[PDB]
A paper describes a structure:
The particles were grouped into five clusters (A–E) in their reaction coordinate space. The particles from each of these clusters were used to perform 3D reconstruction. We further refined these clusters by re-extracting the particles at maximum resolution and performed 3D reconstruction followed by homogeneous refinement. The refined structure for cluster E, with 64,449 particles, displayed the highest resolution (3.4 Å). The outer subunits in the proximal dimer have a relaxed conformation demonstrating an outward concerted movement of at least 5 Å when the distal NTD-CCD is further away from the [name]. When the distal NTD-CCD is closer to the proximal dimers, it makes the proximal dimers more compact. Comparison of the model generated with this refined cluster and the [name] intasome demonstrated the conformational heterogeneity in the distal subunits. These observations are consistent with a more relaxed [name] structure in the RSV [name] as compared to that in the STC, and highlights the overall dynamic potential of the RSV intasome.
Integration of retroviral DNA by the viral [name] (IN) into cellular DNA is a necessary step for virus replication. RSV IN is homodimeric in solution. The 3′ OH cleavage of blunt-ended viral DNA by IN yields intasomes with recessed ends, here termed the cleaved synaptic complex ([name]). We determined the structure of RSV octameric intasome stabilized by a [name]-1 IN strand transfer inhibitor using single particle cryo-electron microscopy.
Residue numbers in the entry:
A (entry chain E), D (entry chain A): 1 to 269
B (entry chain F): 56 to 269
C (entry chain C), F (entry chain D), G (entry chain G), H (entry chain H): 221 to 269
E (entry chain B): 57 to 269
DNA sequence: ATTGCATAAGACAACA
DNA sequence: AATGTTGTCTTATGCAAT
DNA sequence: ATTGCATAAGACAACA
DNA sequence: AATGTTGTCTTATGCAAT
């Protein structure tokens, strides 16, 4: 008896359970009468492709500015992270001006080496003409995320939060509740740099600095099961890197490196 | 071995007013040069220098220097003792405590000018470009080659290689026996991929079925 | 392109949009009337009807 | 050797794993040296006491106001839900005037009866002198939540969202994208009423109406185990109601009824 | 209950301008519903039973007079859409409209009582009409009229208070599903169940429970 | 996009459909002749050859 | 009263309030300096040290 | 506040503390004599008799 | 077998 | 134009001892 | 055993 | 003064059939 069910849904927009219970119907007819209505399902499919990352050290870098009140009158800090090894370099400046951005990078360059790409948000001075021409003079790329989401650079922002936490811990563990004397700024920054880079973070067994200088990369990954966009799991690719958050998988013939959500991959056989 | 002995001194640079005092720290086993600059020769500024040098390179085992006012002063002394580094002094200019410091000083003094004429600065670079010049000089001196060998100081210091294999782990076999000779590749959830060290054959194995080797 | 519904800074979800290029995690979207292309995160769009 | 470990934590504030790996130290000493630092553990305990509810029908009621753009020029709606039975009463008005609340409750009384208590936010006219005087004349309690979080009335807020969804579904299934003609307002409202109250929602096998007029309450609950506030499960109480979200338990001797989250209770034996 | 309904449109001057009053009454429970109307229209005709349906439910038949807005195609199409059986009658007949007599009498009595009780004599304030209508509705439906041993609500809904879960069969160790048991609480994977005779409550896995009949 | 067939209420897996943007809840197919874009659930579709 | 940190509309965790009474899911806290009581939900406060 | 035994770095479980204060990952107890409230993690407390 | 433990798996938050 | 991240915390689990 | 199904369990959102 | 809620959806599981 599905004619009254169709009328009931059309004039009333009833859920499948109640329609089944109220017209002596079962699973199927209740379903294919509830999905006929275009109004019974509008949103519930929101794509989420979440994957910024580099492969080897000195390949992809990120950068953002931070306002740290304890660092007055030089509160502004420039933070740079190498996505491959998660090393951090921060330099202190008084203004967000381009010249400060110029100063920060080469100091980081002298410590980590020369990268190839530096992702950053479209800051007022990152895209400045002088910055662009100087960067081209050095000769490495420059890519900007979408203009407005401070979220595609999630790694530098997360390292920013970590650095602010560490510097707060150091500052108020020494007896400076509200800010820092000018005589303590530099050694606080240096100690913060030494703590994160040269020591483990969380549970990984590999120090970031020796990750950067002594990295390991697989030349050929193990077979895995891959949620190709085709709907289900396809068999026949190999994962290169599988981070806790997200992973990269490689084709067996096309030789494509793709950053894919980690839920889209599972081990083969 | 790397990271065993360090060296330090100062150097007045008239080209770099007003912050005309410059500090240089040099490794001995790798000749890695780390420099930081301060206007006045006090304590706090130079311990800031030493902290930065430690951060960029690591914690050494011994530091040799002169008998300067601050170098043996208390603040520095207990700071180093808390850091746990063996101080060493000597004749202010002796060829042992300052064996490589003067060579690094002359190399840096050549480089700073060379770059200043490179960007056309003769008497004193403005205060804006001082840090950029120092960083460029550090990059040139450290990562490049001025000797006649095939190893840059970075190549000497960090032993930079490109590994291919993960740490070795002793896998358990279905009969219940631990078995070494296997190295993990990918630490996927639930299942970890481990490769036979001999046959280069990978296999997916449950997490608890594998334990680290040695 | 097919019509999609995009969120904005207010949190609403407005109509009158079409997708030109479908990136792996990004998308360039295009007004139905004004006919102007902007890019947007793929997590900030849901389809239409 | 934990002397160097203590020095390392004091001067560096290092995580326990790196402390264990950097000084040849094991689980224990790493832990009780990392918890010594007060700065390393500040936040990670935020209590969540989450429990509004009534027991029987016509005991506890909730109310809020809604701005519905399609209902112009009478957009404002007053929504009332019985916490025990989840039945919904709504009325359409033009002003937030206290008289509107007078009318909305009066109709709510006529359809459902006389409750005992009504919980609501401190609306501009909810606590008005005339409103309170008339409520006292009727002789029913009134209890405002914390002044500022529209979250203690979560039941009426969720009912508000659901009602908005249903009314928009009906309206734009009737072919009205932007607004509804003044003629159709009452028909839409009453159709939503009949769809919501008289048909069960989600998966519960009980219609809200016959939940209200035919409530079931357990005179003696089954034995359960209770995460008593001391932090460990205790044996010897009985659960009165265990909703999908949250539950109520009763003592075996003191006969106290309290509302606790479902995580705090697990079945006995 | 929910079988046959009556209705009529009655005048009253005290609620000007919307002086038009709509009525609808059930048979088995004598429940009332009342709606204001600025003017009797076939659209306002629609507005009434829609509200009446929500408060009471969907009846099985409705009987009325031959009113102008009672007989237009809009009402017929609407009632056909809801699948309810119309049956017109004489505007004043007793074999048809039979409970609406008592309905109108009691409604007018209560309206006068309340309107004079709250200090009004000839015109209710426009903001205070719905107040009086709802109060009269509640008084006439939740309180017994005259000799009535039950109010309309008890007859209409049978508002008993059960205290036991539905009959449910439980998986016995022989694998079968013995009926005569009633669930009490639906916990996490465990549902406390009692026997209708021994009155013993036992926790059982949610995979081992299914309803009776 | 590659050709696909969609599920119709009648019982016909009709051809002439190529997915343009495909999500994890449903797809956005377009016809080859009429070239009209519609959104159909992921279990309403089936690829071509 | 013991020292807790409470949120505000900005989203920070300011310090300087002692809690007086503990509801099941609420609390009233007194400032040290402005020595005044305000009622806050339990899920909005965390201590110091 | 019921009496509770608290823990110190010394190696003993000392008495003389009534928990005014309980949290999910701590307690704040107060001594009878010193009448001082201190946030102590829940691991370092146990019931007094 | 029961308790305790060592680990693993999963959840939360906040960065202008 | 060009996409979340992960340290920290919590709970669950299997083993090892008892 | 393999596939599908019937069910249960878990996850997201948004409401001034 | 007085505390999140739950419909909708997706994923996982087990049994029954093949
Ligand atoms: C144009 C110059 N500019 C910035 C605009 C003003 N901005 C800048 C930032 O650094 C941030 C920032 O860090 N976060 C914090 C944040 C919020 C959500 C996340 F997911 C993640 Cl990873 C980070 N937010 C913003 C912002 O605008 N709106 C949230 C923001 C910036 O440098
Ligand atoms: C003073 C008179 N007044 C209200 C203040 C203005 N308010 C009133 C509301 O009805 C709401 C409301 O519904 N929501 C929506 C909402 C947001 C988050 C949730 F968790 C839930 Cl449960 C509900 N928010 C607010 C608000 O204040 N800030 C978001 C609010 C109101 O009536
Ligand atoms: Zn529908
Ligand atoms: Zn610490």
């Amino acid at each position: 008896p599905l004619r009254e069910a169709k009328d009931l849904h059309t004039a009333l927009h009833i859920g499948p359970r109640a329609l089944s219970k109220a017209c002596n119907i079962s699973m199927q007819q209740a379903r294919e009468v509830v999905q006929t209505c275009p109004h019974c399902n509008s949103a519930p499919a929101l794509e989420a492709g979440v994957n910024p990352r580099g492969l080897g050290p000195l390949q992809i870098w990120q950068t953002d500015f931070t306002l740290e009140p304890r660092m007055a009158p030089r509160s502004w800090l420039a933070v740079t992270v190498d996505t491959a090894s998660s090393a951090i370099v921060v330099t202190q400046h008084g203004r967000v001006t381009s010249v400060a951005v110029q100063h920060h990078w080469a100091t980081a360059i002298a410590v980590l080496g020369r990268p190839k790409a530096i992702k950053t948000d479209n800051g007022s001075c990152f895209t400045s003409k002088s910055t662009r021409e100087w960067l081209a003079r050095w000769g490495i790329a420059h890519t900007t995320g979408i203009p407005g989401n401070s979220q595609g650079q999630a790694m530098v922002e997360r390292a920013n939060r970590l650095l602010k936490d560490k510097i707060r811990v150091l500052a108020e563990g020494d007896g400076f509740m509200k800010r820092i004397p000018t005589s303590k700024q530099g050694e606080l920054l240096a100690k913060a740099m030494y703590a994160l880079n040269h020591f483990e973070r969380g549970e990984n067994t590999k120090t970031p600095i020796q990750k950067h200088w002594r990295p390991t990369v697989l030349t050929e990954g193990p077979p895995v099961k891959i949620r190709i966009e085709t709907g289900e799991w396809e068999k026949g690719w190999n994962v290169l890197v599988w981070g806790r958050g997200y992973a990269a998988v490689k084709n067996r013939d096309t030789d494509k490196v793709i950053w894919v959500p980690s839920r889209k991959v599972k081990p083969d056989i | 071995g790397p990271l065993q002995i360090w060296q330090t001194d100062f150097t007045l640079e008239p080209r770099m007013a007003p912050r005309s005092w410059l500090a240089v720290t040099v490794d001995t086993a790798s000749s890695a040069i780390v420099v930081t600059q301060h206007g006045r020769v006090t304590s706090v500024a130079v311990q800031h220098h030493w902290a930065t040098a430690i951060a960029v390179l690591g914690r050494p085992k011994a530091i040799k220097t002169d008998n300067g006012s601050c170098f043996t002063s208390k603040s520095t002394r207990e700071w180093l003792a808390r850091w746990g580094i063996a101080h060493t002094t000597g004749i202010p200019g002796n060829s042992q405590g300052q064996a490589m410091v003067e060579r690094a000083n002359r190399l840096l003094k050549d480089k700073i000018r060379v770059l200043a004429e490179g960007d056309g600065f003769m008497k004193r670079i403005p205060t804006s470009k001082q840090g950029e010049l120092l960083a460029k000089a550090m990059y040139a001196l450290n990562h490049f080659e001025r000797g006649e060998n095939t190893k840059t100081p970075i190549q000497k210091h960090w032993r930079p290689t490109v590994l291919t294999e993960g740490p070795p782990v002793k896998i358990r076999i279905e009969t219940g026996e631990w078995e070494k000779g296997w190295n993990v590749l990918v630490w996927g959830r639930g299942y970890a991929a481990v490769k036979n060290r001999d046959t280069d054959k990978v296999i997916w194995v449950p997490s608890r079925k594998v334990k680290p080797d040695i | 392109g097919p019509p999609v519904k995009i969120r904005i800074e207010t949190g609403e979800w407005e109509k009158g949009w079409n997708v030109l290029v479908w990136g792996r995690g990004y998308a360039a979207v295009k007004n139905r009337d004004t006919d102007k292309v902007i890019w947007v995160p793929s997590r900030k769009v849901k389809p239409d009807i």
